[PDB]
Amino acid sequence: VNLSACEVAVLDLYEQSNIRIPSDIIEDLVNQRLQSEQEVLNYIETQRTYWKLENQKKLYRGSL
Amino acid sequence: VNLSACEVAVLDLYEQSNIRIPSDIIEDLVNQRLQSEQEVLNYIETQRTYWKLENQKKLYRGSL
């Protein structure tokens, strides 16, 4: 997207720890117009925590 | 995106179980050109399992 400058360095860390970041988190991050690196990381991380939980939810199905 | 017909129904189930589906999973799903409902669901689910795991990975940082 239209990516910032330190954001890009935090993203490069995850890439270096073989973590794939969900593009959903990319979106919400650019909208935060955060100024740091510590700020960025703490934010992606909150989001990973979040997305870990959402993928855990148990689905209700008229299926099986 | 260019969305299918039964896919859309499985997507509607998750929406009905207040599960937000990562758009990454939407992408990979359309590329599967899967024909069912059972097929679709079993696929999204494998993907949720996967994404739950990726968001769990522990990051390595020159930060803290």
Domain boundaries, chain B: 1-64
For residues B7 and A19, give the distance between their C-alpha atoms in angstroms, rounded to a whole number: 28
Q: Which of A12, A39, A59 is the best mutation test for B, with the most CBs of B within 10 A?
A: A59
For residues A4 and B53, give the distance between their C-alpha atoms in angstroms, rounded to a whole number: 27
A56·B61 Cβ contact <8 A: no
**Burial class, B26, CB count within 10 angstroms (exposed 0-12 / middle 13-18 / buried 19+):** middle
B14·A62 Cβ contact <8 A: no
Q: Is some CB atom of chain A closer than 8 A to the CB atom of B2?
A: no
Smallest CA-to-CA distance from A20 within B47, B39, B10 is with: B47
Distances in Å between the Cα of A53 and the Cα atoms of A45, A47, A50 are 12, 10, 5
Q: What Å resolution does this PDB entry report?
A: 2.9
DSSP B35: -
Size of interface A-B (CB pairs under 8 A): 74
Angle at which helix A38-54 crosses helix A7-16, to 10 degrees, equals 50
Q: What are phi and psi of A31, to 5 degrees?
A: -70, 0
Q: Is some CB atom of chain B closer than 8 A to the CB atom of A2?
A: no
Q: What are B49's two structure tokens?
A: 């399992």
For residues A13 and A11, give the distance between their C-alpha atoms in angstroms, rounded to a whole number: 5
For residues B44 and A54, give the distance between their C-alpha atoms in angstroms, rounded to a whole number: 13
The architecture (CATH level 2) of B1-64 comes to Orthogonal Bundle (1.10)
CB A57 within 8 A of CB B18: yes
CB B30 within 8 A of CB B4: yes
